[PDB]
Structure formats: C-alpha cells, structure tokens
Amino acid sequence: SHMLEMKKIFFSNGTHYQKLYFDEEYYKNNNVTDNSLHIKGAGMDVTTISWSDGGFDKAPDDKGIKLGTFRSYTMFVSGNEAIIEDLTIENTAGDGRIRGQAIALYADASKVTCRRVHLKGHQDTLFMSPLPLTEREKGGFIGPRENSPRLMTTQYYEDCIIEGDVDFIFGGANAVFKNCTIVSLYRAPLIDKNTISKEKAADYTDVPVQGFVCAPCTPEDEPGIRFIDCRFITDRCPDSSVYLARPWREKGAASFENCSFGSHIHPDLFAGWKDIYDLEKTARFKNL
Ligand SMILES: [Cl-]
C-alpha cells in the first residue's frame, strides 16, 4: 500500500546543552503522523544530551511554588514509540539535597526502547510513565502529564548504564532492564555552614541511608519493573548502605533476576517507604 517517512535524529559527537521536549506539538509541527521518535548518537559516551534543571528551582511561570520534579527533565519523550541509542542523557543539577529531584529522561511514550544509553543524575534520574493515581504533596505532579490520564507504558533498556542515588529508577511502567550497569552514587556528608570556625572542624549532616535504586508505583495487575542480568555497583558508597527498592506506592513491583550486587547493597535488599525497616506487605519485591 504506502510508505511513510519516520522521524530519526542523529546527535553528533559532543555535548548538546538543551532541554528536549518531544510532545504532541513537536510531532504536529514536524509532520510526524505516527507520533514516534528515534534518536541516535555517535556512541554511549561520545554523544551527550545535557541540561541542569532541578525540582527546587524557581517556578518558570505562575504554576507551582517551584519548578517541580516533573518539569525537571533534560529530555521528555511521548507518543506511540520512542527509541534511543548510543548516547548519554544527563541532568547535571546535582545533589537532590540541594537542587531537589532532577530527571534526565521523562520516558512517557507507550513503547520505549533504549540501547547502549547512559542516564546520569542523582535523585529521580529516570522516570517511566505513568504517574501514581494521586499526588502525596500539593502540586507534586505539575508537568506535561499532570492532568493527563494515567496511561501504562512498556519499556526495554538494553546494555545501558543508569546512575543515581535516591529513587533513580521510578514510575508505574512495565519495564525491563537487560544487561545494564546500575550505579549507586555516594551521598557525602554535607557541611553545616553555620558551624564554620577558624581553628576547629565544622559539623556535618551524615546520611542514614545512601539510596534506593528503584521506586515503582506499579498498578495492581501489571508486572512492573524487572532487572535481568544487571550489575549493581557504586562509586564509593559504604557497605550495606543502599536498598534495591522501596515502594513509591503500596503495590509497586520490582524483581531482580540473576543480578549481581556489589557490597554496597544491604543484605535485606528492600526498604519500606513509611519505615525503612518495615516493608509494606503489599509490595511485590522479588530476587530470583
Ligand atoms: Cl518495548
């Protein structure tokens, strides 16, 4: 019957500093009638897409008291399908204690495939649609999908590297991570600046827990997030300081199949949300 031109973009080697928003408006204006996007770089770390918006920043408009998690993204992609290969996407805002949540990829398309992609941030590095049913804090979901329906998505990440500290893979998606390196980043004691003296050490706020890798809000019936043959490593987190998962919503699901865990991973594996030491019995966390 007929042929149609599809949208595929190459990003040269180098760093591209921009906030990419691949929404309905982008597709209509570029005549992408199948609302699908393929992006390609010159190699996982030779091409870098980069921005530095953080959730605690000033609000850019009359909406919200702050920029917000879900407006923090370096790249947002929606539509029927998104494919991303051979590049890095980073949010360089920094430590979540200072700049707040800061998304590298807001992955919102019904089908998402990432091959040989490096995602870098700290808190909330990778977000996979959908959002939970209801916000826990006022305005918490302000962003592209705040008032959109909670559509399920299906996501595959192959030979990727994903970095962060706190809830850095999160959302309600059905997602598979296959042969990925999952890097927990150390959260250093922060100096209390009002304790600076001339001849004496300052005081520091230590961190009880170094991080949680995965924070799903999986709906009841869906399989949710699966890590397969993935490696969990750290830069310099201390032993037994990191949890694989905590349930962002009561019934979140995360499974780890034939994964290898560095010694930064706590032997209990999974943390509660309310209470780190009491995992809500409704969570679906498994290590096979
Ligand atoms: Cl897929």
mmCIF file of all heavy atoms in Angstrom, residues 187 206-210 241 276-277:
data_model
loop_
_atom_site.group_PDB
_atom_site.id
_atom_site.type_symbol
_atom_site.label_atom_id
_atom_site.label_comp_id
_atom_site.label_asym_id
_atom_site.label_seq_id
_atom_site.Cartn_x
_atom_site.Cartn_y
_atom_site.Cartn_z
ATOM 1 N N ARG A 187 26.486 9.733 48.557
ATOM 2 C CA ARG A 187 25.974 10.998 49.038
ATOM 3 C C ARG A 187 26.796 11.361 50.269
ATOM 4 O O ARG A 187 26.718 10.711 51.304
ATOM 5 C CB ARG A 187 24.474 10.905 49.331
ATOM 6 C CG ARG A 187 23.615 10.901 48.070
ATOM 7 C CD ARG A 187 22.162 11.242 48.323
ATOM 8 N NE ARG A 187 21.603 10.286 49.275
ATOM 9 C CZ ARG A 187 20.591 10.548 50.095
ATOM 10 N NH1 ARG A 187 19.986 11.708 50.015
ATOM 11 N NH2 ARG A 187 20.188 9.668 50.987
ATOM 12 N N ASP A 206 25.449 13.645 58.269
ATOM 13 C CA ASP A 206 25.613 12.325 57.684
ATOM 14 C C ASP A 206 24.265 11.854 57.151
ATOM 15 O O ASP A 206 23.227 12.458 57.386
ATOM 16 C CB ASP A 206 26.195 11.293 58.659
ATOM 17 C CG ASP A 206 27.721 11.258 58.688
ATOM 18 O OD1 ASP A 206 28.331 12.242 59.184
ATOM 19 O OD2 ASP A 206 28.308 10.247 58.211
ATOM 20 N N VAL A 207 24.320 10.781 56.365
ATOM 21 C CA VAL A 207 23.165 10.278 55.649
ATOM 22 C C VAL A 207 22.876 8.890 56.204
ATOM 23 O O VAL A 207 23.753 8.026 56.200
ATOM 24 C CB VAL A 207 23.432 10.222 54.135
ATOM 25 C CG1 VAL A 207 22.141 10.429 53.355
ATOM 26 C CG2 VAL A 207 24.511 11.213 53.705
ATOM 27 N N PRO A 208 21.647 8.630 56.706
ATOM 28 C CA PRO A 208 21.357 7.335 57.324
ATOM 29 C C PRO A 208 21.457 6.244 56.253
ATOM 30 O O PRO A 208 22.197 5.270 56.392
ATOM 31 C CB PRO A 208 19.949 7.521 57.926
ATOM 32 C CG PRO A 208 19.327 8.689 57.160
ATOM 33 C CD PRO A 208 20.480 9.531 56.652
ATOM 34 N N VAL A 209 20.776 6.476 55.130
ATOM 35 C CA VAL A 209 20.767 5.529 54.037
ATOM 36 C C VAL A 209 21.325 6.217 52.791
ATOM 37 O O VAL A 209 21.016 7.370 52.519
ATOM 38 C CB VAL A 209 19.330 5.003 53.868
ATOM 39 C CG1 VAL A 209 19.206 4.009 52.737
ATOM 40 C CG2 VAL A 209 18.838 4.382 55.158
ATOM 41 N N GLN A 210 22.152 5.499 52.032
ATOM 42 C CA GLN A 210 22.836 6.086 50.893
ATOM 43 C C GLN A 210 21.865 6.274 49.733
ATOM 44 O O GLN A 210 21.938 7.284 49.024
ATOM 45 C CB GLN A 210 24.036 5.233 50.509
ATOM 46 C CG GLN A 210 25.307 5.623 51.244
ATOM 47 C CD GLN A 210 25.666 7.049 50.917
ATOM 48 O OE1 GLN A 210 25.749 7.440 49.758
ATOM 49 N NE2 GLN A 210 25.853 7.851 51.945
ATOM 50 N N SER A 241 24.649 0.071 52.539
ATOM 51 C CA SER A 241 24.070 1.394 52.726
ATOM 52 C C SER A 241 22.975 1.685 51.696
ATOM 53 O O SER A 241 22.357 2.747 51.756
ATOM 54 C CB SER A 241 25.164 2.444 52.645
ATOM 55 O OG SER A 241 25.785 2.452 51.350
ATOM 56 N N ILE A 276 11.868 2.352 56.711
ATOM 57 C CA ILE A 276 12.895 1.600 56.007
ATOM 58 C C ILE A 276 12.945 0.138 56.469
ATOM 59 O O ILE A 276 13.261 -0.756 55.679
ATOM 60 C CB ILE A 276 14.249 2.327 56.181
ATOM 61 C CG1 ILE A 276 14.305 3.634 55.386
ATOM 62 C CG2 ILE A 276 15.412 1.428 55.817
ATOM 63 C CD1 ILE A 276 15.309 4.639 55.904
ATOM 64 N N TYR A 277 12.622 -0.111 57.749
ATOM 65 C CA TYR A 277 12.841 -1.398 58.403
ATOM 66 C C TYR A 277 11.561 -2.229 58.455
ATOM 67 O O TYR A 277 11.590 -3.315 59.024
ATOM 68 C CB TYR A 277 13.472 -1.165 59.783
ATOM 69 C CG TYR A 277 14.739 -0.347 59.678
ATOM 70 C CD1 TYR A 277 14.809 0.945 60.177
ATOM 71 C CD2 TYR A 277 15.831 -0.815 58.957
ATOM 72 C CE1 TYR A 277 15.939 1.727 60.000
ATOM 73 C CE2 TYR A 277 16.973 -0.055 58.785
ATOM 74 C CZ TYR A 277 17.029 1.220 59.314
ATOM 75 O OH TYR A 277 18.146 1.997 59.141
#
